[PDB]
Amino acid sequence: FSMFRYSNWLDKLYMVVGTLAAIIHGAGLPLMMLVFGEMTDIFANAGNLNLEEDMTRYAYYYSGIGAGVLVAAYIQVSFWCLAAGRQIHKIRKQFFHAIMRQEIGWFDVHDVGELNTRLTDDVSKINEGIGDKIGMFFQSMATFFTGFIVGFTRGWKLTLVILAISPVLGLSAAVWAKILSSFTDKELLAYAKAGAVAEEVLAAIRTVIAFGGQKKELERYNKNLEEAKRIGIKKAITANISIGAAFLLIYASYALAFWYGTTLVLSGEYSIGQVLTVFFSVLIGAFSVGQASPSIEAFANARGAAYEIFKIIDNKPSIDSYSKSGHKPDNIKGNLEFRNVHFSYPSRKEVKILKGLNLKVQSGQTVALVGNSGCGKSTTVQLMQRLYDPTEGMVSVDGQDIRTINVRFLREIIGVVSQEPVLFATTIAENIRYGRENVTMDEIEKAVKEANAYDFIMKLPHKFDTLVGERGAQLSGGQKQRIAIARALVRNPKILLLDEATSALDTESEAVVQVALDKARKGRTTIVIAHRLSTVRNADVIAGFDDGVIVEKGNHDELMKEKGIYFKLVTMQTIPPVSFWRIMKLNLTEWPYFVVGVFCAIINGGLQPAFAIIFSKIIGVFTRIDDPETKRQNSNLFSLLFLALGIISFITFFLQGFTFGKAGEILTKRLRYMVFRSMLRQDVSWFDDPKNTTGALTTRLANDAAQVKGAIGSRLAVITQNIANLGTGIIISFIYGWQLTLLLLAIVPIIAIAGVVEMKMLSGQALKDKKELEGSGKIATEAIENFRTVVSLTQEQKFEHMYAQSLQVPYRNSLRKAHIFGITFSFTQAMMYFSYAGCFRFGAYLVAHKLMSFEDVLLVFSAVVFGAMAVGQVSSFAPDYAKAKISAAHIIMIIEKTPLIDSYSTEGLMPNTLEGNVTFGEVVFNYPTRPDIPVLQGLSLEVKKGQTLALVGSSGCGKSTVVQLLERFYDPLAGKVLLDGKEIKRLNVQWLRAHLGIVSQEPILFDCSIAENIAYGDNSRVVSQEEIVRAAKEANIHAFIESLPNKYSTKVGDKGTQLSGGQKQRIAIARALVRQPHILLLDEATSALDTESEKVVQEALDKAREGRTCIVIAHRLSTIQNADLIVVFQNGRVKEHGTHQQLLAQKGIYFSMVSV
Ligand SMILES: CC[C@]1(O)C[C@@H]2CN(CCc3c([nH]c4ccccc34)[C@@](C(=O)OC)(c3cc4c(cc3OC)N(C)[C@H]3[C@@](O)(C(=O)OC)[C@H](OC(C)=O)[C@]5(CC)C=CCN6CC[C@]43[C@@H]65)C2)C1
Ligand SMILES: CC[C@]1(O)C[C@@H]2CN(CCc3c([nH]c4ccccc34)[C@@](C(=O)OC)(c3cc4c(cc3OC)N(C)[C@H]3[C@@](O)(C(=O)OC)[C@H](OC(C)=O)[C@]5(CC)C=CCN6CC[C@]43[C@@H]65)C2)C1
Ligand SMILES: Nc1ncnc2c1ncn2[C@@H]1O[C@H](COP(=O)(O)OP(=O)(O)OP(=O)(O)O)[C@@H](O)[C@H]1O
Ligand SMILES: Nc1ncnc2c1ncn2[C@@H]1O[C@H](COP(=O)(O)OP(=O)(O)OP(=O)(O)O)[C@@H](O)[C@H]1O
Ligand SMILES: [Mg+2]
Ligand SMILES: [Mg+2]
Predict the structure, then answer these.
(1) Domain 336-573 CATH (choose: 3.30.70.270, 3.40.50.880, 3.40.50.300, 2.30.260.10)
(2) Which residues form the pocket of ligand 2, taking CB atoms under 6 Å from any ligand atom?
């Protein structure tokens, strides 16, 4: 995959013209430097002695080359970006077409989300990897070679030494980049412990809040943050040392080159202009190669990904849903013959589900299926639709094999109502019309009437226009089934397969659905897989599938007389803003560091005007007319000075780095600490919201250093360095004349913006496109995750056309952005050449009257222009400021958060002793996530000291909500709750959490030692190993722990992978019992555990029941039998209360549950 461009045979003209334009543009700059050297030489010759004519001629040369540069740059960038846009459009369209056309098995194998992220990331990477980067690389190569050519043709010795020095700097920069990358990877690795701890704690937020173990997790995260801080400080020091060494090497090379050139010219060789042009061209060539480092790498970054994408296009599917070569029968009579159907799913090919079966079905035969859970009746259903292919068998209709007919046409005549129908997020009318494009409003009404969906469909607003919510959120359990049935019927299917037709909420609509389905069956063959036998009785025939083969056959009476498995089954069943002054939170911790950093930044910035002054003096050495030998010595004084400056730079930068990094890491630590603390000292409701997801929160806490540290330190560093450099240059220039200084000030801004934009053109080329790509994202994703239904009804054509339109809508935007980027880049490039021309023409005109010496004019020009270029480059170098500012605003918002239930708060009551007598009255509460769904209906409970209460009812009554409110996770909307006649709100939060104990319905265990895991139940006190052993004996886990290796030292794995689920539940129960809470709550303690284990847990609870109020929420009525009191929930309202014997005497809802 070295040449992965294949589209728009006429687009290659764009690529070729762009390549030529890039070559000529890169070659131009060395020509500009050559004419600059010639102009300097002629100016020096004039100074030694009509200069106006020569100055005008060279100004015209500058103007012509600048116009050529503008045209070439526009052609290059515009054409290359045009080609990139066209290629990316074609690639995305083809890739989506291939994905939709792919076979079902291939999708079932690979993760669908993986495929979606592959699509988006790979296409974005390819977009970044061609067009702009290719043009930049060709420009860099052309500049390299042309500069070397200019140096050689106008130099024989100085060019050689410059070229030989160049690889030293190149290798130094390469090794610096390599070490920086490796150490950045190491630093990333250094956050593994912190990331894991944060993820585990956030996932266990509920349990940790219940146990009040914030301090230990915070300390662990603090240790991890300290390690990461050391790593980051080392990283920053290394990077700053590398940059300083690069600058030192550059200045050493410049000093050596200028010294050698001065010696050579003093020997009588080529004059100063030749030295200047040769040196500048050599440096341009030697440093242009570095500009190519991203492009090629980006190409590689865009290379491998492309490979993978192409593979997906390459694979021709076994079942081409888009192919039309398949035969198309004219009249399709209802008749099915599946003989020796043997097959298995390639996802797990080891297990063979289909082992050959015989099934002959006539027209309009409601052949029901009977078997066991997982017997493979849904495999027979799937194989019926021709999605897969039998390993060895024959499925035919009307004597013709399934493969003998076109897949699309064959699937069109066959409708399937899956167990979990999915409706696309379109209009209900569009949902119905998905069956066939040629569907009229009258047909839609007829289908609605047949499905008996007229009431539900028309009652809501927009009867034929309502947009179905994501995954039918607005729809109902039976509404989706009715809509699917109507859509299936809209296609006039010949074979209708059904699976779990109305197994969603009840059978009220099931009767209507069955009546509608059975209304028309003469021509439309039917197959049904219904768990309920109600419709089985009316079934024309019933086939019993077992061991991958049909066993039972015949009518219901025949099956009953045959003593089949079906007979036994029937018998049994019957945008906050930001602020800088406010964001100055590092001053307290960096009062003496920021000052040194600013001082070093000022010195580094002033280094540039020092270079300008030194270079101007060096040129003036020969610009002078005295021409003594002393100049040689003077030249040395200048030449050596160069080296000195470099050394100073190498110091300051290093001294800067250790400062800046030290300023950063500290904050990076503190924030990472503080934010995490602020995360724990918050209410659960804050964690209960779409915004706060564990992944989002942990990423925000993880990728925050680079933003806050950037915006704080780097902003000040770059601002100080830039003000130093540019202001010093401006003042020094104004000292040496002002008119030329005024013109150069006028032309500085274009230079600065050009530098900034060109620097940004490498990395941040593609950052705003996604905001439009999402317009198709959903459309693609909706067709990937929910692809089974789409392939079922053959609706890929509409999805691909919609994808085409959604790509077209931003395609014009992409074209326009390409054009504007090209135009602005070309104008930016031409700006420098125009500035050179105008400024030097003005300087020549001024010096003609002896107003200012040529040396002064050159000094001002160099100072101001080089300062503009330096500010552009350095401003581009620093991290982006907007993203950093918004991230810092988010961090400030998080850290400043004030909760409704603050654990850290010391305001509250801390009673010495309590009887644990709970009294809740008129308890009203709603979940802040969905306040429009109240769960509490004014409960009334009064549990006395040493009293056991149990909660029963139907799922969804909020049983777990009672426990949640007991721990004071959520404040009550209304009602009074008192533990021994004391207001809950007035009571302390930490004391309440410690004194009480709970057992999670879904217990989780951290990746800690068994002893440590058990001890984590309690906090703020050292638990002796003897206490842990006694508690384990309480839960009957001491012997189990001893049996396993390491005893309690056995490091429990993540979620206790090694340990059994029942073992994890027992460990959680033991941890809860360690604190010996007065009030203990177990929500489905049994749940999934050994019956003997549940009995042992109940016995252990009873042993400590005395003086320990207990609450139990479990489905095992046997445990509730001995419960002191039982309360049955009725939609959040308690119906009956009292002892179990009283409940038995007072028959009611519980009576049915006990019998059930
Ligand atoms: C004329 C073109 C060029 O000279 C090319 C680079 C950038 N500038 C000139 C000055 C310069 C360079 N580096 C600077 C750092 C701070 C301030 C200025 C510079 C330049 C260099 O060292 O002079 C020879 C350079 C730059 C980079 C550079 C190497 C380099 O020296 C050749 N790296 C290749 C990239 C880089 O992003 C990368 O991915 O390395 C693979 C790299 O990151 C790493 C991993 O170190 C790095 C640090 C050197 C990171 C942040 C900024 N990016 C920009 C590109 C990259 C650099 C050379 C213009
Ligand atoms: C249209 C915007 C712009 O292209 C921006 C820069 C300036 N001009 C274009 C011409 C240009 C650039 N460089 C030239 C060298 C010789 C002749 C012409 C140029 C430009 C570039 O490299 O594009 C390929 C550039 C120039 C520099 C430049 C960056 C730059 O863009 C890559 N640097 C800011 C300085 C520089 O001296 C410096 O950073 O250290 C002091 C820098 O040295 C380094 C470290 O690369 C360098 C270029 C190698 C060296 C010697 C002379 N100084 C003066 C300014 C500085 C340059 C690009 C206009
Ligand atoms: N598309 C599929 N990909 C992979 N495995 C599948 C697929 N469909 C079914 N299976 C698995 O193959 C076996 C066959 O069971 P299948 O799902 O076909 O039964 P069923 O008739 O739907 O019964 P039930 O719904 O009562 O479990 C099961 O283990 C099932 O999980
Ligand atoms: N964090 C939450 N976000 C959204 N809804 C929630 C949240 N916590 C609870 N709910 C809602 O509260 C109810 C959950 O009931 P709860 O589990 O408290 O009682 P239950 O009778 O023990 O439950 P189940 O019958 O499901 O075992 C559901 O309505 C659920 O939507
Ligand atoms: Mg099934
Ligand atoms: Mg529950």
Answers:
(1) 3.40.50.300
(2) 29, 33, 250, 280, 283-284, 287, 608, 751, 754-755, 758, 828-829, 831-832, 866, 869-870, 873
